[PDB]
């Protein structure tokens, strides 16, 4: 693996608290049960991380594997970002249809972008987008996270600056599922569970 992907995995593991480490890594399901047995987790973090980075080399970790561990960190630490709610207005054959559509729209608009996915059993997708330009590489340390619940008109994003790549994200989301318009709602929270609670409650009154 490249030193860029190796560094990203290092900084990701470094910010994981020690007690959580063994649970996140199992959830990641990239390093094997056998590989992880060789690691003793009861010393300095710096020793733990270099052993784990070695194990990623053995397993030939790509950027996609790195991006997936990052999603899992975020899934276990949703509170670290402020989530905005977005509403769409109006069928897919599949979730795979959405993922390929969405990925292409972004990677055609700009050339350098990392678009990764994780599916949860709620018919929901986590999207992680690391933005780059036509000329510059993707910034893996300032990514955008999207949580789209497929059978709803609702999508939840983590806004950091609300950049020039923010109208494009709306566009891509809107096009990739069978929707015509997107609008930002005036609903912010650090807690996604609490936002789900308001938008899916008032989605049940109207329909």
Author numbering: 1 to 90, 97 to 213
What did the published study say regarding this structure?
CENP-N1-235 consists of two closely juxtaposed domains that interact through an extended interface to form a single structural unit. Fold-recognition by DALI identified similarity of the first domain to PYRIN domains (PYDs; a superposition is shown in Figure 2—figure supplement 1A–B). Besides identifying the N-terminal domain of CENP-N1-235 as a PYRIN domain, DALI also identified an unanticipated structural homology of the second domain of CENP-N1-235 with the N-terminal domain of Iml3CENP-L. We therefore refer to these domains of CENP-N and CENP-L as CLN-HD (for CENP-L and CENP-N homology domain). Monomers A and B in the asymmetric unit are quite similar except for a minor hinge-bending between the two subdomains of each monomer, and except for loops 137–142 and 164–174. Our study did not identify a clear structural basis for this phenomenon, as we failed to identify significant conformational changes in CENP-N in isolation (crystal structure) compared to its complex with CENP-ANCP.
A crucial role in this process is played by centromeres, specialized chromatin domains whose defining mark in almost all known eukaryotes is the enrichment of centromeric protein A (CENP-A, also known as CenH3), which replaces histone H3 in nucleosomes. The primary function of centromeres is to provide a platform for the assembly of macromolecular complexes known as kinetochores, whose task in turn is the physical capture of microtubules of the mitotic spindle. In vitro, these interact specifically and selectively with two CCAN components, CENP-C and CENP-N. Binding of these proteins to CENP-A nucleosomes has been shown to require two regions where the CENP-A sequence diverges significantly from that of histone H3, the L1 loop and the C-terminal tail. In conclusion, the structure of CENP-N contains an N-terminal Pyrin domain, a central CLN-HD, and a C-terminal CENP-L dimerization domain, while CENP-L contains an N-terminal CLN-HD, interrupted immediately before the C-terminal helix by an insertion that contains a region required for CENP-N dimerization.
